[PDB]
């Protein structure tokens, strides 16, 4: 019984769910656009369970399909799970609020509506993001991935908005942070990530 | 062996961690390093940051059949805990916290005038959030089901400071939300932490 994801595949929050589903090898069906295509929250159905909110859906998927091969939350190991949780929360409350206004001002608003970019909002965000990337640079100088030497929910959570940031004029900023840039290219080589990236087209 | 929390007891995010420690009956120290400062935490050689990550580590480590606040052995119950934890983080708290800043934090710590127009932008926005809470808590005593969980405890710190602003009586128009808030305030762990967010 394939689970159902409701929403536009190019939404950052729908792509978070489908990336998790691809990383665990689950079969699923994506059901149509809306009723913003870049931000809309997914609904989800697995049998009689109906869920909302992409982070809760994603964690349900990573638990239900966990194997010894594929354990992206590490819940049996409290130290590892704690590090997954830490960098999941850094994404949600620190990295994404610094990066997503750049994506909206430079990519989404011009692309969807021909709206002008507000360079003052973008510039505030860039200075905030630069301080954040200094922290990621030190972390990813110690480990291949954010939670340790294994890929996890923490890394996957960074994919959808960062992918769109890479289509703005500021993508070159990551080159000032070579270990962050190395980590980004590691993620972009994963076959599940390439699969979802091909779905994220306007 | 006791664990250490780093940060001010007053902080909304330190209180999330200390409430979790009190509900599991854990032995801990608090070491004072505005109302939103992110805590650090030490257990042996494990050093953590971010109150929700620390809180979950605590609720897993000290878990018992009496105190299972994450519900991780039942994927469907854990899903509902996660849903309402996210609603708190990205919907309820962004509605509620600017009322705390512009009625309580900024007029009594930063010396700013109480911007009584972003207060009404937040109030009208909080009103439509509470409608959804009122429907949810009308067929469950708690957010994740008929059991208290991390989802409910997550709402305590900011709601405790909202309850100290002029607009505390807004909950009275949502009787199932009010009755839910009353069940949380009656817990001994909650009463004990509430006493720390004041001196």
Author numbering:
A (entry chain B): 2 to 36, 50 to 216
B (entry chain A): 2 to 34, 51 to 216
Verbatim from the authors:
GSTs are a multifunctional superfamily of enzymes, distributed in all major kingdoms of living organisms. They are long established to catalyze the conjugation of the tripeptide glutathione with diverse electrophilic and hydrophobic compounds, resulting in their modification to display higher solubility and less toxicity. GSTs that belong to the phi class are dimeric enzymes, comprised of two identical subunits. Residues of the N-terminal domain residues assist the formation of a GSH binding site (G-site), whereas hydrophobic residues of the C-terminal domain form the hydrophobic substrate binding site (H-site).
The structures of sh101 and sh155 enzyme variants were resolved at 1.87 and 2.00 Å resolution and compared to the wild-type AmGSTF enzyme structure that has been recently reported. Sh101 and sh155 were crystallized with two and three molecules in the asymmetric unit, respectively. The sequence between the β2 and β3 strands where the α2 helix is located exhibits significant distortion due to high flexibility. This part has not been modelled in sh101 because of the high flexibility and lack of electron density. Amino acid sequence alignments of the sh101 with the parent enzyme AmGSTF showed 94.98% identity. For instance, the region Tyr118-Arg127 has three substitutions in sh101 sequence (Gln119Glu, Phe122Ile, Met125Leu), as a result of the replacement of the C-terminal part of the α4 helix by the sequence derived from the crop-type GSTFs (TdGSTF and HvGSTF). Among the selected enzymes, sh101 and sh155 exhibited the highest improvement in kcat values (185.9 ± 1.8 min−1 and 197.7 ± 3.2 min−1, respectively), corresponding to an approximately 5-fold improvement, compared to the wild-type AmGSTF enzyme (35.9 ± 1.7 min−1). Furthermore, the sh101 enzyme exhibited lower S0.5 and Km values towards CDNB, leading to significant improvement (7–8 times) in catalytic efficiency compared to the parent enzyme AmGSTF. In particular, the Tm values of sh101 and sh155 enzyme variants were significantly increased by 8.3 and 5.2 °C compared to the parent enzyme AmGSTF. Inspection of the crystal structures of sh101 and sh155 shows that Lys93 can form a new salt bridge with Asp62 of the opposite subunit.
